[PDB]
Design a protein around this nucleic acid. Structure first.
Ligand SMILES: O=Cc1c2[nH]c3ccccc3c2cc2[nH]c3ccccc3c12
Lengths: 327, 288
DNA sequence: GCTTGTCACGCGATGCCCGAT
DNA sequence: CATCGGGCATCGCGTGACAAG
């Protein structure tokens, strides 16, 4: 023995007893290091002290046992319905709290994030922006590091509320950001990534659809009947492509073949999907009967590339927007 | 510049920072425990004291719910994908919709929304993530609610379903678990020959303040001043009689600020190149 | 085969406690 | 009522062992 080692042993004993009480699974406590043991002890105490003053049930008129069981999980239900995670950040840009689902969206462990600097999770070029939001309602966007790539852009919707019970020095409480971070919606676009996905549609002479194969149902999202009850195919065309499609329809009327055209179709989700199509005229007794269009879905990248290298220059060429379709 | 010394010095300063971090965390503990100048072992023993008193998850379910609701409001609801039958609704439905927990139970999500939306509701309930915008009721009065949720296999794990429970005979296979929360330019558009917005340019936001989803489905006359409504209507009726010809009309469009904006609309018809029938009416709407 | 970080250890400079002045 | 020297406990520092990555 010797006094220094005695004191270190007592310190480590107190540290282990602190680790034993942390509200984490045992496999998480075992991997912890003493510094983060102290860190999350402090963070748990701060959280409990805030909840001691800010916090505090089915209507007894409508209370069943199953409803009680669901009420005992209401919190996790909300957390799962968030489609994202919770963030509570102090004025020092310290993470007062982050929900577990942050690991679902960024790859960071909740116990590694709590009581740490928020900027370590946020892209440099955006950190300044975040600061301006920290100093009542708030709605903005930020790029956070995603270990599952590497960054992810996310919408933060939250508020600035006083983080009570922090016992700073006694100083008054400071404004903390209570926000929900959710991923960014990709633009209203549909890009089939399944390779080799050419599909054919059948139409009458005015381009009103009458038949379609399985891959067409998969990409466009309509049932076979649903395709043919909503007017001609021009009811399905993006307004930036209507005139090009009309020109190529005239070309097919005059020569039987349309040539390769690139344009956007309206899915049943009311999204736009790019297609490179080719319309051929089928004949009955030497007279035109119906149209056989064969389409290959494109990505947004090469779609905008084809649009930017457009042969004809027609009005509404660069227009963007949304549409609906009725029967 | 002598690697062995650079490594030594940076390592020394690294655990110097480590020691400082440990001391700062101990000081925070001293600040956050009850009874408390004491030394490190005193503070650690009193921290064990307090933590044994206070005590798996970092937060309780109610603490997590409190954090989420403080963050961005909302009320949780759980409905069956089959009939829309409301399995569960939180008490948050009272501060959100001004409705008792009681009007939603024993009811159906279709009965709580606007009729013009029930179809879309079926859209969102048939057959993971879901996100939509509807109008729920609070003469009756409705309100726009943004709903974000997911499809979950029913019944949920952990929750016991007794025999005499009312949920015991339902037997729904899937559920929707969601949160509901209350929330000089020009642009082009395509309408049917009645005036209903069927295509809206995004620039409408910079032009009249509305988002495209707020215009699509609505007739343009709904946004026109009552004294200019017949004029705009006859403009639409005349542009159909004169195929290809352009007709301009000036009227007052009510922006979403409920402000009247003078707008010039140029309309013409798109003809099917085979049948010469009208597909829609193209309008360019410009501020004045 | 190198980097960063955790943990123990030795080692003195001060702290605390307390008979003994 | 202090002040004063023991002996052990706290406490901060630098370094070496060891491992995850
Ligand atoms: O109505 C134009 C159209 C078209 N409308 C549709 C509606 C539903 C599904 C597919 C289509 C479709 C495919 C097309 N392929 C074309 C080549 C040249 C010119 C026009 C078209 C055209």
């Amino acid at each position: 023995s010797n006094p220094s080692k005695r004191h270190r042993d007592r310190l480590n004993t107190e540290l282990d007893r602190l680790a034993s009480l942390l509200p984490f699974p045992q496999d998480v406590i075992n991997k912890l290091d003493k510094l983060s043991v102290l860190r999350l002890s402090v963070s748990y105490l701060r959280a409990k002290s805030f909840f001691d003053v800010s916090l505090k049930g089915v209507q007894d008129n409508c209370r069943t046992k199953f409803r009680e069981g669901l009420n005992l999980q209401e919190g996790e239900f909300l957390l799962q319905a968030l489609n994202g995670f919770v963030l509570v950040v102090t004025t020092d840009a310290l993470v007062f709290y982050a929900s577990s689902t942050i690991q679902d969206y960024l790859g960071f462990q909740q116990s590694d994030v709590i009581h740490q600097s928020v900027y370590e999770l946020i892209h440099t070029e955006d950190r300044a922006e975040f600061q301006r939001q920290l100093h009542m309602e708030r709605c903005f966007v930020c790029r956070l590091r995603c270990l599952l790539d590497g960054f992810l852009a996310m919408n933060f919707q939250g508020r600035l509320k006083y983080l009570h019970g922090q016992n700073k020095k006694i100083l008054p409480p400071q404004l903390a950001l209570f926000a929900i971070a959710t991923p960014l919606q990709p633009p209203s676009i549909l890009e089939i990534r399944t390779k080799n996905f050419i599909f054919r549609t059948k139409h009458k002479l005015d381009f009103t659809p009458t038949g379609c194969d399985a891959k067409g149902k998969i990409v466009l999202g309509y049932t076979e009947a649903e395709l043919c009850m909503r007017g001609t195919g021009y009811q399905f065309i993006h307004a930036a492509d209507m005139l090009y499609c009309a020109e190529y329809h005239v070309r097919m009327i005059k020569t039987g073949e349309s040539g390769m055209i690139v344009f956007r179709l309206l899915t049943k989700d009311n999204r736009w999907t790019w297609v490179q199509s080719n319309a051929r005229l089928v004949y009955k007794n030497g007279r035109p009967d119906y149209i056989i269009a064969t389409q290959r879905p494109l990505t947004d990248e090469e779609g905008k590339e084809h649009l930017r290298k457009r042969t004809l220059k027609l009005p509404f060429m660069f227009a963007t927007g949304e549409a609906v379709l009725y029967e | 510049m002598d690697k062995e010394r650079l490594a030594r010095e940076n390592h020394s300063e690294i655990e110097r920072r480590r020691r400082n971090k440990m001391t700062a965390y101990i000081t925070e503990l001293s600040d956050m425990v009850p009874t408390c100048k004491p030394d490190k072992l005193t503070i650690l023993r009193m921290a064990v004291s307090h933590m044994k008193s206070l005590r798996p998850s970092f937060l309780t379910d109610q603490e997590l719910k409190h954090l989420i609701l403080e963050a961005a409001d909302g009320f949780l609801f759980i409905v069956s994908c089959e009939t829309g039958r409301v399995v569960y609704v939180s008490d948050s439905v009272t501060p959100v919709l001004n409705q008792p927990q009681s009007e939603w139970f024993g009811s159906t999500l279709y009965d709580q929304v606007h009729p013009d939306d029930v179809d879309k509701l079926r859209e969102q309930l048939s057959t993971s993530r879901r996100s939509f915008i509807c109008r729920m009721r609070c003469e009756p009065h409705f309100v726009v609610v943004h709903c974000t949720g997911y499809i979950k296999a029913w019944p949920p794990a952990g929750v016991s379903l007794p025999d005499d429970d009312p949920e015991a005979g339902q037997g729904s296979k899937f559920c929707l678990v969601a949160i509901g929360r209350l929330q000089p330019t020009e642009f082009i558009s395509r309408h049917n020959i009645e005036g209903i917005f069927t295509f809206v340019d995004h620039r409408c936001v910079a032009t009249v303040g509305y988002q495209p989803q707020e215009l699509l489905g609505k007739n343009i006359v709904e946004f026109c001043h009552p004294e200019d409504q017949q004029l705009l209507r006859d403009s639409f009726q005349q542009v159909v009689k004169l195929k290809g010809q352009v007709l301009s009309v000036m009227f007052r469009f009510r922006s979403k600020n409920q402000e009247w904006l003078w707008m010039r609309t140029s309309s013409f018809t798109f003809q099917n190149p085979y049948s010469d029938e009208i597909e829609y009416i193209i309008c360019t709407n410009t501020n004045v």
